[PDB]
Design an enzyme around this catalytic site. Structure first.
Site, PDB file in Angstrom:
ATOM      1  N   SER A 145       0.801  -0.994   0.023  1.00 27.88           N
ATOM      2  CA  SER A 145       0.037  -0.137   0.079  1.00 27.88           C
ATOM      3  C   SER A 145       1.046   1.407  -0.129  1.00 27.88           C
ATOM      4  CB  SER A 145      -1.107  -0.062   1.072  1.00 27.88           C
ATOM      5  OG  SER A 145      -1.777  -1.180   1.087  1.00 27.88           O
ATOM      6  N   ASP A 253      -7.444  -2.290  -7.737  1.00 31.09           N
ATOM      7  CA  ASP A 253      -7.326  -2.175  -6.061  1.00 31.09           C
ATOM      8  C   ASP A 253      -8.128  -1.164  -5.467  1.00 31.09           C
ATOM      9  OD1 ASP A 253      -4.635  -2.289  -4.222  1.00 31.09           O
ATOM     10  OD2 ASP A 253      -5.420  -0.097  -4.218  1.00 31.09           O
ATOM     11  N   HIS A 297      -6.796  -5.557  -1.985  1.00 24.89           N
ATOM     12  CA  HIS A 297      -6.014  -4.676  -1.494  1.00 24.89           C
ATOM     13  C   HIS A 297      -4.828  -5.418  -0.690  1.00 24.89           C
ATOM     14  CE1 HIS A 297      -5.074  -0.972   1.300  1.00 24.89           C
ATOM     15  NE2 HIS A 297      -4.607  -0.775   0.116  1.00 24.89           N
TER      16      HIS A 297
HETATM   17  O1  LIG Z   1      -2.108   2.693   2.245  1.00 21.69           O
HETATM   18  C1  LIG Z   1      -2.955   2.456   1.538  1.00 21.69           C
HETATM   19  O2  LIG Z   1      -3.795   1.860   1.873  1.00 21.69           O
HETATM   20  C2  LIG Z   1      -3.197   3.434   0.220  1.00 21.69           C
HETATM   21  S1  LIG Z   1      -2.053   4.763   0.180  1.00 21.69           S
HETATM   22  C3  LIG Z   1      -2.462   5.397  -1.618  1.00 21.69           C
HETATM   23  N1  LIG Z   1      -3.612   5.000  -2.050  1.00 21.69           N
HETATM   24  C4  LIG Z   1      -4.201   5.630  -3.037  1.00 21.69           C
HETATM   25  C5  LIG Z   1      -3.495   6.470  -3.721  1.00 21.69           C
HETATM   26  C6  LIG Z   1      -2.205   7.133  -3.613  1.00 21.69           C
HETATM   27  C7  LIG Z   1      -1.788   6.551  -2.096  1.00 21.69           C
HETATM   28  N2  LIG Z   1      -0.513   6.830  -1.705  1.00 21.69           N
HETATM   29  O3  LIG Z   1      -0.028   6.125  -0.554  1.00 21.69           O
HETATM   30  O4  LIG Z   1       0.419   7.140  -2.467  1.00 21.69           O
END
Ligand SMILES: O=C(O)CSc1ncccc1[N+](=O)[O-]
Ligand SMILES: *[C@@H]1O[C@H](CO)[C@@H](O)[C@H](O)[C@H]1NC(C)=O
Length: 351
Positions: A145, A253, A297
């Site tokens: 993530s 995702d 995810h």
């Molecule tokens: O940690 C998580 O569950 C998601 S993080 C994330 N998610 C979507 C777009 C950008 C990001 N970011 O971290 O660049």
């Protein structure tokens, strides 16, 4: 179990100024080291960081961390659960900087919070060198993530750090799980007027300023001042990296769908199908990748991570084939991207 070590350099801190740290399980005689970056979104201004501090405090502070954690999935030391690297030295680095592992800013009279994710990784590497990492053959920087994006942002800096410290023989590699995002059009649109309505491109642009965020040098040189947010998007930063990086990404995702404002009629069907097609397209020239057609995810630290397969090949197998490729291989593939167009068209998707 992996055992907690708080950083000896107590200037390298979580958001609230408490010491950052890492959990370690050594494997005597193994020269493989797995350093895993936890995920968990981010915060990008005083108000939303304050809210995160109230109800996600373990992601902003070490004060309540337990003394041990159980290694699961790729961090498991049991070959039954981890066919890939069960005998490796295992390191879990908690995410307590809320900055996608990009920050280089201390708490000060001008900063309510410290955003030190990039420095946390460097300090963990430094302190591990005295604990056996100096003898390593391979250091795999993995993450899920926000931690997967953190791999993309930090893997070449770890390589540069070890080179400058005099360890050119340690092969640094990256494993980015669920951190390969698209700066695509949302299914429904809102201008960035608060936290919920702010799309990642704008939230990240603001975050970089708030965190003093840093991105890999070649990517920074391409996009230049004010555009470093581009380097948080895997398809843009990946071609600038030198270290070998294996990309794991569900085609659908859940974090991607969240930032796309997706929660089925023709408009949404076409949107979801186009998302999967676009993700597949970005991976076409990524030789080490595992991208199943599932709505899910993360994968790599889940206990049942061995269950999913693409074209009959599991992720632990694909990672093993990647290891062999870094010494094509008959029946040992490393590029595994589903072509079917709808979540769960792969029968091995998580239930
Ligand atoms: O940690 C998580 O569950 C998601 S993080 C994330 N998610 C979507 C777009 C950008 C990001 N970011 O971290 O660049
Ligand atoms: C502690 O960490 C800070 C921030 O990364 C660094 O500037 C400093 O040199 C470190 N000090 C020691 C003694 O390692």
């Amino acid at each position: 179990d992996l055992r907690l070590h708080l950083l000896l350099n107590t200037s390298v801190t979580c958001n609230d100024g408490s010491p950052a740290g890492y959990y370690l399980k050594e494997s005597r005689g193994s020269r493989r080291w797995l350093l895993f970056l936890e995920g968990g979104w981010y915060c990008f201004n005083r108000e939303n960081c304050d809210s995160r501090y109230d109800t996600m405090r373990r992601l902003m502070s070490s004060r309540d961390w337990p003394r041990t954690r159980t290694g699961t999935g790729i961090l498991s030391s049991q070959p039954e659960e981890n066919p890939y690297w069960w005998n490796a030295n295992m390191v879990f680095i908690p995410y307590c900087s809320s900055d996608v592992w990009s920050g280089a800013s201390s708490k000060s009279e001008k900063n309510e919070y410290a955003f030190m994710g990039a420095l946390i990784i460097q300090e963990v590497v430094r302190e591990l060198l005295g604990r056996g990492l100096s003898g390593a053959k391979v250091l795999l920087l993995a993450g899920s993530s926000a931690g997967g994006t953190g791999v993309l942002l930090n893997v070449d800096r770890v390589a540069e750090q070890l080179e400058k410290l005099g360890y050119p023989a340690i092969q640094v590699r990256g494993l980015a799980d669920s951190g390969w995002f698209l700066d695509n059009k949302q299914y429904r649109h809102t201008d960035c007027v608060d936290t919920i309505t702010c799309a990642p491109t704008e939230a990240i642009r603001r975050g970089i300023r708030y965190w003093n965020g840093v991105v890999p040098e070649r990517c920074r040189r391409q996009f230049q001042e004010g555009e470093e947010w581009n380097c948080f998007f895997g398809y843009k930063v990946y071609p600038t990296l030198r270290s070998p990086v294996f990309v794991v990404q569900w085609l659908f995702d859940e974090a991607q769908l969240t930032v796309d404002n997706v929660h089925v009629q023709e408009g949404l069907r076409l949107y979801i199908q186009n998302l999967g097609r676009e993700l597949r397209h970005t991976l076409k020239d990524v030789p080490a990748s595992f991208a199943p057609a599932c709505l899910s995810h993360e994968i790599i630290i889940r206990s049942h991570w061995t269950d999913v397969q693409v074209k009959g090949t599991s992720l632990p197998r694909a990672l093993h084939c990647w290891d062999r490729s870094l010494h094509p291989l008959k029946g040992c593939p490393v590029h595994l991207v589903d072509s079917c167009p709808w979540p769960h068209c792969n029968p091995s998707c998580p239930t």
